[PDB]
Amino acid sequence: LCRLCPWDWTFLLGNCYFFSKSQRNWNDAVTACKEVKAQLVIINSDEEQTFLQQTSKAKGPTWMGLSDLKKEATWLWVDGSTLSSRFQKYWNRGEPNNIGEEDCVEFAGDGWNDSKCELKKFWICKKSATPCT
Amino acid sequence: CRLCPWDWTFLLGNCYFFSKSQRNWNDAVTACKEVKAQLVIINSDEEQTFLQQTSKAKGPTWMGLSDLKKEATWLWVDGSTLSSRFQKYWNRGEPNNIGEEDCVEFAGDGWNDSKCELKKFWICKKSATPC
Numbered sequence: 001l002c003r004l005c006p007w008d009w010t011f012l013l014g015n016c017y018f019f020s021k022s023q024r025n026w027n028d029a030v031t032a033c034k035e036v037k038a039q040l041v042i043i044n045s046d047e048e049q050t051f052l053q054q055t056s057k058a059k060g061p062t063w064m065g066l067s068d069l070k071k072e073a074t075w076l077w078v079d080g081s082t083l084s085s086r087f088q089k090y091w092n093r094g095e096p097n098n099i100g101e102e103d104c105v106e107f108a109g110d111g112w113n114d115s116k117c118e119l120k121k122f123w124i125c126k127k128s129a130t131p132c133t
Numbered sequence: 134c135r136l137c138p139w140d141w142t143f144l145l146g147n148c149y150f151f152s153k154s155q156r157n158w159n160d161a162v163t164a165c166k167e168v169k170a171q172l173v174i175i176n177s178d179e180e181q182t183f184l185q186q187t188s189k190a191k192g193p194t195w196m197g198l199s200d201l202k203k204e205a206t207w208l209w210v211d212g213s214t215l216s217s218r219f220q221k222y223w224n225r226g227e228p229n230n231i232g233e234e235d236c237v238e239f240a241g242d243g244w245n246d247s248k249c250e251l252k253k254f255w256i257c258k259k260s261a262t263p264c
């Protein structure tokens with residue numbers, strides 16, 4: 001009867017998140033989320049970052065939909081929006097480093113790293129949920 | 134790496150299943166027992182927060198709390214006593230209708246007590262398996 005998210009996706013605050021069980025490079029992951037009409041995960045709330053951060057820690061490193069592939073040092077979400085000042089706090093100390101060599105962002109432990117996009121990692125999709133009358 | 138069974142949500146070392154249908158309280162207990170889980174027991178505030186918002190999207194939802202053993206004492210389905218640190222979650226004006234509304238539900242932003250005969254959504258919880 002009342003189903004908020006696709007089967008095996010988790011509901012959180014009006015959206016549905018899918019946690020990959022396997023690992024892929026950054027671009028593939030984008031493609032993988034695209035294939036289910038979703039986006040490699042974009043963060044725009046702290047409750048979200050807290051929920052996503054904890055899941056990832058139990059699995060391991062996990063890609064999010066953030067990168068500076070358009071322009072070194074500028075960090076864009078796949079929807080084109082710029083990284084907000086309110087989120088810089090999520091960088092781990094010593095991150096981001098290796099600018100121009102590590103162009104994609106991952107959850108790592110308790111914060112974000114930038115990394116070689118070529119590496120395979122777990123990933124996460126996000127799309128909007130569907131209500132119940 | 135699979136933390137929880139298919140269509141179950143991982144949270145802080147446990148697994149959660151959200152029903153798509155509604156059942157009276159005792160049935161819901163049964164349903165949980167069918168999959169080696171319990172009608173949900175809260176023991177953390179991050180947990181209470183997650184469930185609360187999830188229920189909101191669906192509708193009133195049962196948890197594994199009741200005073201069926203003894204009017205006015207609220208025990209979890211596992212027999213454990215309700216903690217002082219969690220009393221804050223009763224909505225204002227809850228618990229009421231004591232001795233007539235014997236089971237606890239998520240309702241809005243806190244907990245109500247309700248007639249156990251009512252059909253409501255439910256949530257099961259059981260421990261996860263790591264990677």
Ligand SMILES: CC(=O)N[C@H]1[C@H]([C@H](O)[C@H](O)CO)O[C@@](O)(C(=O)O)C[C@@H]1O
Nearest residue numbers: 094095096097098102108113114115116
């Ligand atoms: C492999 C190595 O020797 N040092 C690595 C350090 C260490 O990880 C940190 O000093 C502590 O973890 O930082 C990187 O991983 C990073 O995030 O870009 C790359 C770098 O090559």
Ligand SMILES: CC(=O)N[C@H]1[C@H]([C@H](O)[C@H](O)CO)O[C@@](O)(C(=O)O)C[C@@H]1O
Nearest residue numbers: 205225226227228229230231232233234
């Ligand atoms: C006259 C009277 O006793 N009324 C009832 C009230 C009201 O239900 C609440 O005040 C909410 O309006 O309180 C009880 O729930 C309670 O706490 O035991 C039962 C009680 O029988």
Ligand SMILES: [Ca+2]
Nearest residue numbers: 097102113114
């Ligand atoms: Ca880095």
Ligand SMILES: [Ca+2]
Nearest residue numbers: 229245246247
């Ligand atoms: Ca009531």
Ligand SMILES: [Cl-]
Nearest residue numbers: 137138139140
């Ligand atoms: Cl399974």
